[PDB]
């Protein structure tokens, strides 16, 4: 698995788009880099829904070509929200080959190995600074074949080093 990223907006434009709800940029790729005023996170497109963490998006709309997109799925207890994916996003497919060495795609488009530990827990195969994972919530956890098994929720860390991640299973989507 490889990844590369492409910024599409700067600061002024993010701000105004948030107030208008109206996104006329052409959308593409599997994973959207999102921002509000408060934070920046990711959304994984899986079966034509853009998914992301509830602790990031809250219950807010997603700016779209025609104006704000209402959440179609809002689960506060699973920390999961979903918007109808904007046209152009590349939709991933949920894994089922059931592999257990997994791949976390970050905001910096690195692709870090994660050992599946349980339904929605993983251990990093080599420690990263947690700072490096900041902004990656919502990102995809991939199996070797490129399918999605979930989206990053939370890093478990001590003294600044992320050892394990918590994730929301694709199952729950």
């Amino acid at each position: 698995i490889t990844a590369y990223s492409q910024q599409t907006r700067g600061l002024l434009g993010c701000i105004i788009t948030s107030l208008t709800g109206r996104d006329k940029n052409q959308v593409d790729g599997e994973v959207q880099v999102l921002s509000t005023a408060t934070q920046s996170f990711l959304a994984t497109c899986v079966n034509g829904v853009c998914w992301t963490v509830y602790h990031g998006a809250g219950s807010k709309t997603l700016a779209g070509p025609k104006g704000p997109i209402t959440q179609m799925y809002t689960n506060v207890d699973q920390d999961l929200v979903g918007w109808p994916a904007p046209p152009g996003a590349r939709s991933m497919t949920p894994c089922t080959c059931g592999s257990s060495d997994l791949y976390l795609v970050t905001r910096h488009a690195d692709v870090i190995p994660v050992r599946r530990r349980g339904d929605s827990r993983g251990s990093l195969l080599s420690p990263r600074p947690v700072s490096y994972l900041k902004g990656s919530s919502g990102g995809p956890l991939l199996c070797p074949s490129g399918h999605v098994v979930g989206i990053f929720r939370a890093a478990v860390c001590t003294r600044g080093v992320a050892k394990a991640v918590d994730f929301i299973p694709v199952e729950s989507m």
């Binding site: 492409q6 907006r9 993010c14 709800g21």
Partner: peptide, 12 residues
Amino acid sequence: GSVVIVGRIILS
């Protein structure tokens, strides 16, 4: 206001 897409990640 809205959540805004400010970039993307392409998967290979």
